């Protein structure tokens, strides 16, 4: 294994370093507004050194944006692919690339057998070429890497099954900035090349000037270059035809043959039919554009994309584009003075030719590390807004992410009879989640009715996962001698205390116990992580006199708290007189299950404690039915609370963290939570779904005298306050506290609510943010850039640190954030914007709705931690912050047995499963084979992160090939499971290096 801490990789372009140098001047460059006037020497080209031009037709199909997936399919995409099939069949030299497999499967499954064979023919002979072949073209800012892999795996498995093809070239023309997570996953999925478009205009200029638009993109920690993927960055403002032929859109627009009027050319010179009369002059103009574009790149091979949104719909558009380009190609190729060979081509064709030029020693390409956030398309129009837009669904993404892993893991242990419909359920679940990864899904940049479609699909997917999980649990914990399933029956319902949140939707079930009817209830906890976990769990119960046992009747220590809900004239808490929370510690095996029993008594049981409740405000009495401890009252004041050995938190009189004492000796380290607001510009560019354009720094929110509720218990205490737009909550269970914000922005139009942390941490201009929950990247605040350019994606966490102290905030949801000054962290909660931001959504964001945001706050000492070089572009979590992220993203699942009685019930599953080192995860367990198959196969994705070593190192070796019994073979595969990289002598899967991801398939006889 490489070391990813001590050795800094040496690369030609390190993006953080480049950002430090660059001046980012927005100077008028001419016809190319954000570059310069390109010059070429015309003697560069001659009969022995010619320009090879690949013109690559394409059609950018959004799986939802202005219309839903199904609306677009019917109005646009089904016509585009019909005409692709007809026109390419008839025109052998004509070519076309296709990215979005969601649309292509929809189409293909509706064809007659004859058309399917014709379609296979134009794919087999290379006319229609799939690029990337993911279900969607995903967002790269907010997306979790697991969901990036999910949507790629889904599209590629479809392509391999139905077209016998796996793309090795990726096409990503539309995501709003680009993550190095993509090459990381692609290069481990058999990919050899990738293309990107939406990078900062100043980055395009800078790289174009050095011919560094094509580069070997490696991970920021990779010394060796094993992760390197050949990347082509397109040079111009857009992927459309005006911005793809060359530097002068006014010329290029004239070679978009669909623009001959109800579309026109903004530059006011229309396209003209190519004729014998004009082909010489038209060709001179176009080749001059081609040759200017070629100056920006190192080979004599030129990529010319030919397409736009939902292009190639009309069969006449196929004609007018194909016929005019043929006449140009016929003239140009027959005229030696051009020294061009021009033809319709595919992306793979382009890349093969570029590597032939490299193999032949005509170019050597520079190395790059870093990301391409935050994207600006012009002036100060930074796309940091979509890091936060529609935060309800951003949260829902992470919840569905977990349920799909748990459903596929739980159901993977057994083959299922097809009458169970496990395969169907999981396919629906994978595809709805995969679709939401689209750059108009998770981004929150779609119209209101499309967001509603995405919500409804994710809701159906969650229900499908629940059905699979509860069937799997009943099977895993019922004696085989009794197990006799009704595949349509709910044996368990799922309890989830964090989605949607009782504050958002009053939807948790009360386990109703009574000494006559239902004295006891079985509950089950699932642990998807491959190590022993001991986590507090809670359930709603109809009486406070409840005791907890394992199935062996060993007593388990519990706490009962009241059920609090918040209400709005003044924002004040009310208690239930009818239901209570039972809280206890579940110990659950690796990738396993543990059963416990909730039992009623007439009175206080031996092993169950009751929290006190203190309501700080001019009081009036609050009953809690049979809850034995009466609510105490009082005036706002400062409070300290501690749970177990874990930290002591001090809170203000408005109920907001002002300090954390780690240990009993150590200091009360200042840590202030405050809510602020950004507004919208009155004159200038308006903030929208995409753009964050604040009218200067955030201004504090008037809290007034808010009602602060304090609940204090042996196992769990919390401080909650009803602030305007936010019920803020700090929960303590004996480690890093958990923060919950119930965010209701109401109709505070032209407002972005932010949450800031103020410390004395001497961070300076340095902060760290993660990319797709895979890696932490060093950010440097740049005073030379406006505020919105210092905002970055916070997909799963952010941190600051000096020589001694670190503060890490972990998120349960992707949101936008920064460190706008030394010892600060801030993360946006929600945004409501009256105005469109003129990127084609055609509305602002006025569909806000209550969301429950969840966080972990890890203050820790790092003076004794081995930290990377001051010159390393990466950061790494501590064990405590990694485990805290794990408790947000993949908590224990909770199952309440539905029936009065459970014959066959067992207490545990997975007792024998290995408990792997804390840095290793089984990201994916997925059975690859239906029952009717003599060889069963199960895929595993193993990720190993890298944690800062702090000199405090109980760990069985995990071999996923020996998890299921009767193994006949073990293969290391691509992360899609679609290719064998080795049959493993030993039938053992070996341990993977820090920051490595590897996939294995185990076979069974
Ligand atoms: O960018 C994308 N598509 C092309 C965009 C066309 C819409 C541009 O309208 C500009 C204006 C229309 C009217 C209202 C105002 C002022 C003028 C008139 C010009 C704005 C792609 N990226 C999108 C991201 O959401 C989407 O995933 C699409 O595939
Ligand atoms: Zn798009």
Atom of ligand 1 nearest to the CA of 445: 25
Tell me which of 839, 842, 843, 844 to substitute to probe ligand 1's pocket, judged by most ligand atoms within 8 Å of the beta carbon. 839
- Residue 913 annotated in ligand binding: no
Using a 6 Å cutoff on CB, does residue 308 contact ligand 1? Answer: no
Closest residue to atom 14 of ligand 1, CA basis: 838
Is residue 694 within 8 A of residue 688, CB to CB? The reply is no
Give me ligand 2 centre to Cα 173, in Å.
8
Give me ligand 1 centre to Cα 673, in Å.
38
Residue 497: how many other CB atoms lie within 10 Å: 18
Helix 391-412 crosses helix 879-889 at what angle (to 10 degrees)? 90
Is residue 325 within 8 A of residue 290, CB to CB? The reply is no
If you classify domain 380-490 with CATH, what class do you get? Answer: mainly alpha
Closest residue to atom 19 of ligand 1, CA basis: 838
- Residue 439 annotated in ligand binding: yes
Using a 6 Å cutoff on CB, does residue 309 contact ligand 1? Answer: yes
Using a 6 Å cutoff on CB, does residue 240 contact ligand 1? Answer: no
The architecture in CATH of the region 491-611+891-912 reads Sandwich (2.60)
Calpha distance 327→595 (Å, rounded):
74
Atom of ligand 1 nearest to the CA of 240: 4
Q: Beta partners for 584? A: 537, 558
Closest residue to atom 5 of ligand 1, CA basis: 840
Which ligand gives the minimal distance to the CA of 67? Answer: 1
Give me ligand 1 centre to Cα 174, in Å.
11
The residue with tokens 């749970």 is 643
Atom of ligand 1 nearest to the CA of 446: 25
The residue with tokens 């059905």 is 467
CA atoms within 13 A on the CB side of 1005: 4
The residue with tokens 């000096």 is 802
Give me ligand 2 centre to Cα 376, in Å.
16
After which residues is the chain discontinuous, taking C to N > 2.5 Å?
261, 569, 617, 953
- The tokens for 626 are 């049979």
Q: Beta partners for 674? A: 756
Peptide bond into 338 cis (omega under 30): no
Peptide bond into 952 cis (omega under 30): no
Calpha distance 601→820 (Å, rounded):
55
DSSP three-state, residue 965: coil
If you classify domain 1-379 with CATH, what class do you get? Answer: alpha beta
The residue with tokens 């570029």 is 354
Closest residue to atom 7 of ligand 1, CA basis: 840
Using a 6 Å cutoff on CB, does residue 840 contact ligand 1? Answer: yes
Using a 6 Å cutoff on CB, does residue 685 contact ligand 1? Answer: no
Using the Cα atoms of residue 777, residue 778, residue 782 and residue 786 in order, give the sign of their dihedral: positive
Calpha distance 162→534 (Å, rounded):
45
Give me ligand 1 centre to Cα 336, in Å.
41
The answer to whether 830 is a known catalytic residue is no
Using a 6 Å cutoff on CB, does residue 60 contact ligand 1? Answer: yes
For the domain bounded by 913-1005, which CATH number is listed?
2.60.40.1360
Give me ligand 2 centre to Cα 101, in Å.
14
Atom of ligand 1 nearest to the CA of 840: 7
Calpha distance 332→325 (Å, rounded):
10
Tell me which of 840, 841, 844 to substitute to probe ligand 1's pocket, judged by most ligand atoms within 8 Å of the beta carbon. 840
Is residue 871 within 8 A of residue 766, CB to CB? The reply is no
- Residue 60 annotated in ligand binding: yes
Is residue 289 within 8 A of residue 246, CB to CB? The reply is yes
Fill in the DSSP letter of residue 677. E
Using a 6 Å cutoff on CB, does residue 974 contact ligand 1? Answer: no
Using a 6 Å cutoff on CB, does residue 174 contact ligand 1? Answer: yes
Closest residue to atom 24 of ligand 1, CA basis: 440
The residue with tokens 């874990």 is 646
Using a 6 Å cutoff on CB, does residue 838 contact ligand 1? Answer: yes
As a dihedral over the C-alpha atoms of residue 398, residue 533, residue 588, residue 931, rounded to 10 degrees, the angle is 50
What is the domain partition of the chain in residue ranges? 1-379, 380-490, 491-611+891-912, 612-890, 913-1005
Calpha distance 14→10 (Å, rounded):
9
3-state SS of 363-407?
Answer: CCCCEEECCECCCECCCCCECCHHHCCCHHHHHHHHHHHHHHHHH
Give the phi and the psi of residue 129 in degrees, each rounded to 5.
-120, 130
DSSP three-state, residue 967: strand
Atom of ligand 1 nearest to the CA of 690: 25
- Residue 683 annotated in ligand binding: no
H helix or E strand, kind and range, residue 860: strand 851-861
Distances (CA, A) of 752 to 549, 681, 829: 47, 12, 7
Largest CA distance in the chain: 100
Distances (CA, A) of 562 to 244, 539, 559, 731: 63, 11, 10, 14
Using a 6 Å cutoff on CB, does residue 42 contact ligand 1? Answer: no
Using a 6 Å cutoff on CB, does residue 445 contact ligand 1? Answer: yes
Closest residue to atom 20 of ligand 1, CA basis: 838
Calpha distance 266→250 (Å, rounded):
8
If you classify domain 612-890 with CATH, what class do you get? Answer: mainly beta
Give the phi and the psi of residue 927 in degrees, each rounded to 5.
-75, 130
Closest residue to atom 6 of ligand 1, CA basis: 840
Using a 6 Å cutoff on CB, does residue 982 contact ligand 1? Answer: no
In the PDB record, what is the listed experimental method? X-ray
The residue with tokens 């929110």 is 701
- Which of 635, 667, 633, 671 minimizes the C-alpha distance to 651? 671
- Which of 453, 492, 463 minimizes the C-alpha distance to 400? 463
Using a 6 Å cutoff on CB, does residue 61 contact ligand 1? Answer: no
Atom of ligand 1 nearest to the CA of 439: 27
Atom of ligand 1 nearest to the CA of 443: 25
Calpha distance 490→43 (Å, rounded):
77
Calpha distance 727→706 (Å, rounded):
10
Distances (CA, A) of 991 to 149, 723, 741: 21, 49, 39
Given the residues 76, 174, 397, 921, select the one marked as catalytic: 174
Atom of ligand 1 nearest to the CA of 238: 1
Give me ligand 2 centre to Cα 677, in Å.
30
Calpha distance 629→560 (Å, rounded):
10
Closest residue to atom 1 of ligand 1, CA basis: 839
Which residues have CB under 8 Å from 388's CB, separation 6+?
394, 444, 752, 815, 816, 828, 829, 830, 831
Is residue 942 within 8 A of residue 999, CB to CB? The reply is yes
Distance of CA 18 to the CA centre of its chain: 26
Give me ligand 1 centre to Cα 66, in Å.
10
Calpha distance 769→827 (Å, rounded):
11
H helices, E strands: number in the chain: 16, 50
Triad 825, 830, 835: Cα angle to 5°: 120
Give me ligand 1 centre to Cα 877, in Å.
39
Give me ligand 1 centre to Cα 444, in Å.
15
Which ligand gives the minimal distance to the CA of 308? Answer: 1
H helix or E strand, kind and range, residue 807: strand 805-811
Tell me if 1-379 shares its fold with 491-611+891-912.
Answer: no
Closest residue to atom 3 of ligand 1, CA basis: 309
Task: Report resolution (Å) to 1 decimal.
Answer: 2.0
Which ligand gives the minimal distance to the CA of 383? Answer: 1
Using a 6 Å cutoff on CB, does residue 58 contact ligand 1? Answer: no
Give me ligand 2 centre to Cα 38, in Å.
29
- Which of 865, 827, 836 minimizes the C-alpha distance to 946? 865
Using a 6 Å cutoff on CB, does residue 550 contact ligand 1? Answer: no
């Amino acid at each position: 294994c490489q070391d990813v801490v001590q050795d800094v990789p040496n690369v030609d372009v390190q993006m953080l370093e480049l950002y430090d140098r660059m001046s980012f001047k927005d100077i008028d460059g001419g016809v190319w507004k954000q570059g310069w006037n390109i010059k070429y020497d015309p003697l560069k080209y001659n009969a022995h050194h010619k320009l090879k031009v690949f013109v690559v037709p394409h059609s950018h199909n959004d799986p939802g944006w202005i219309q839903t997936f199904e609306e677009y399919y019917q109005h646009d995409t089904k016509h585009i692919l019909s005409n692709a099939l007809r026109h390419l069949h008839d025109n052998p030299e004509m070519k076309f690339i296709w990215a979005e497999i969601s649309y292509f499967a929809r189409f293909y499954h509706d064809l007659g057998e004859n058309k399917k064979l014709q379609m296979k023919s134009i794919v087999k002979n290379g006319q229609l070429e799939f690029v990337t072949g993911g279900w969607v073209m995903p967002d790269e800012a907010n997306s979790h890497w697991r969901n990036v892999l999910l949507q790629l795996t889904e599209g590629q498995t479809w392509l391999k099954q139905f077209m016998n093809v796996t793309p090795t070239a990726s096409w990503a023309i539309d995501p709003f900035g680009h993550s190095p997570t993509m090459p990381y996953i692609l290069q481990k999925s058999g990919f050899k090349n990738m293309l990107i478009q939406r990078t900062h205009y100043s980055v395009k200029k800078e790289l174009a000037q050095q011919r560094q638009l094509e580069f070997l993109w490696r991970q920021i920690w990779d010394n060796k270059g094993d992760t390197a993927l050949f990347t082509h960055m397109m040079p111009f403002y857009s992927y459309d035809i005006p911005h793809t032929c060359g530097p002068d859109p006014k010329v290029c627009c004239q070679f978009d043959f669909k623009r001959m009027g109800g579309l026109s050319c903004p530059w006011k010179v229309p396209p003209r039919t190519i004729s014998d009369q004009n082909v010489a002059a038209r060709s001179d103009l176009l080749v001059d554009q081609w040759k200017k574009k070629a100056e920006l790149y190192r080979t004599n091979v030129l990529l010319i994309p030919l397409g736009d949104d939902f292009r190639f719909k009309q069969n006449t558009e196929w004609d007018v584009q194909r016929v005019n380009y043929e006449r140009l190609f016929e003239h140009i190729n027959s005229q030696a003075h051009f020294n061009v060979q021009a033809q319709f081509g595919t992306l793979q064709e382009y890349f093969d030719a570029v590597h032939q030029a490299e193999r032949a020693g005509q170019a050597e390409f520079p190395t790059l590390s870093g990301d391409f956030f935050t994207y600006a398309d012009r002036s100060d129009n930074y796309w940091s807004g979509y890091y936060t837009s529609r935060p309800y669904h951003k949260r829902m993404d992470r919840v569905l992410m977990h349920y799909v892993r748990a459903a596929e893991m739980l159901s993977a242990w057994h083959s299922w009879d097809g009458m169970a419909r496990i395969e169907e359920r999981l396919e629906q679940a994978r595809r709805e989640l995969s679709l939401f990864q689209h750059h108009d899904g998770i981004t929150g940049t779609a119209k209101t009715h499309v967001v509603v479609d995405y919500e409804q699909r994710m809701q159906e997917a969650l229900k499908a996962c629940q059905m699979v999980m509860q069937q799997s649990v009943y099977r895993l914990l019922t004696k085989p001698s009794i197990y006799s399933p009704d595949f349509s029956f709910s044996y368990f319902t799922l309890d989830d205390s964090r989605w949607p949140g009782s504050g958002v939707e009053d939807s948790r079930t009360t386990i109703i116990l009574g000494e006559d009817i239902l004295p006891s209830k079985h509950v089950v906890m699932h642990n998807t992580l491959p190590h022993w976990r001991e986590q507090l769990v809670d359930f709603y119960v109809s009486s406070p006199f409840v005791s907890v046992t394992d199935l062996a009747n060993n007593p388990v220590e519990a706490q009962v708290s009241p059920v609090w809900s918040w209400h709005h004239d003044t924002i004040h808490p009310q208690g239930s007189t009818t239901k209570y929370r039972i809280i206890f510690k579940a110990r659950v095996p690796p990738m396993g299950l543990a059963t416990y029993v909730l039992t009623i008594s007439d009175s206080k049981p031996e092993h169950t404690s009751y929290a006190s409740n203190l309501l700080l405000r001019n009081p009036t009495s609050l009953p809690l039915g049979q809850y034995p401890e009466d609510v105490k009252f009082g005036d706002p004041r400062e409070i300290s609370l501690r749970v177990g050995n874990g930290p002591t938190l001090a809170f203000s009189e408005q109920g907001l963290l002002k300090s954390i004492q780690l240990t009993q000796d150590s200091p009360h380290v200042p840590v202030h939570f405050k809510f602020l607001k950004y507004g919208v510009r009155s004159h200038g560019d308006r903030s929208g779904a995409y753009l964050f354009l604040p009218n200067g720094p955030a201004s504090p929110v008037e809290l007034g005298q808010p009602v602060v509720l304090v609940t204090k218990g042996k196992l769990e205490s919390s401080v909650s306050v009803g602030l305007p737009s936010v019920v803020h909550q700090t929960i303590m269970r004996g480690g890093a506290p958990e923060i919950r914000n119930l965010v209701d922005i109401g109709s505070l139009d032209n407002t972005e609510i932010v949450m800031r942390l103020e410390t004395h941490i001497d961070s300076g201009d340095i902060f760290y943010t993660d990319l797709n929950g895979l890696q932490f990247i060093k950010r440097r605040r740049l005073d030379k850039l406006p505020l919105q350019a210092n905002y970055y994606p916070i997909p799963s966490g952010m941190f600051i640190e000096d020589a001694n102290t670190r503060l890490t905030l972990l998120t349960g949801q992707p949101l936008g954030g920064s460190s706008l000054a030394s010892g600060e962290l801030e993360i946006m909660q929600d945004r409501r914007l009256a105005s469109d931001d003129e990127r084609g959504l055609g509305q602002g964001v006025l569909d806000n709705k209550p969301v429950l945001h969840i966080y972990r706050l890890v203050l820790e000492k790092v003076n004794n931690c081995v930290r990377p070089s001051e010159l390393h572009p990466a950061g790494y979590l501590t064990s405590a912050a990694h485990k805290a992220s794990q408790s947000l993203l993949d908590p224990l699942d909770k199952f309440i047995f539905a029936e009065n009685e459970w014959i066959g019930a067992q207490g545990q599953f997975g007792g024998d499963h290995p408990s792997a080192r804390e840095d290793l995860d089984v990201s994916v367990m997925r059975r690859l084979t239906k029952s009717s198959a003599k060889t069963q196969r199960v895929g595993y994705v193993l990720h190993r992160t890298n944690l800062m070593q702090c000199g405090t190192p109980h760990t069985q070796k995990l071999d996923v090939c020996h998890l299921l019994p009767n193994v006949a073979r073990c293969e290391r595969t691509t992360l899609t499971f679609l290719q064998n990289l080795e049959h493993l002598d030993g039938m053992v899967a070996p341990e993977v290096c820090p920051m490595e991801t590897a996939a294995y398939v185990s076979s069974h006889s």
